[PDB]
Amino acid sequence: SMSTVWEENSPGGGVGEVLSYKFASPMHIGRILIVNGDTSSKENYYKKNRIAKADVKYYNGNKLVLFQKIELGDTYTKKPHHIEIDKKLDVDRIDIEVTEVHQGQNKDILALSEVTFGN
Numbered sequence: 001s002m003s004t005v006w007e008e009n010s011p012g013g014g015v016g017e018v019l020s021y022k023f024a025s026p027m028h029i030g031r032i033l034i035v036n037g038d039t040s041s042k043e044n045y046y047k048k049n050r051i052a053k054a055d056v057k058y059y060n061g062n063k064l065v066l067f068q069k070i071e072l073g074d075t076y077t078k079k080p081h082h083i084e085i086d087k088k089l090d091v092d093r094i095d096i097e098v099t100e101v102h103q104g105q106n107k108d109i110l111a112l113s114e115v116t117f118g119n
Helices: 042-046
Strands: 018-021 031-034 053-058 066-071 081-084 094-098 116-118
Touching: 066 081
Parallel strands: none
Antiparallel strands: 018 094, 031 081, 031 116, 053 066, 053 094
16 A cells, blocks of 8 residues: 655654655544564664654644644563554544654664554
8 A cells, every 4th residue: 555664854764854644535544553663672772763752643624633642651562553543533634743762873774664544
């Protein structure tokens, strides 16, 4: 369905960039899944770039309809994360802004499997 893992603007793993997507027509949304890097080991996390925090929002369809932020608070990982949205409205405007990353030693590592959007 989707093409390319992510859009490489120029910095390491698109650090600080704004992941903006444009809509062709309305679509219903339920939940989003996000996997952080290859997820090999925590020692690897220190040597790898992590999203850390990210603010995602859905606009249009009726002005501001959805708005929420995400955080990892540090913890063991391996399977893709999963955010739960109210699942009861179809609009599409996607704004996902990452504010910073932790350590980010390698600068531009492996491109995550891909974040999923929908139900």
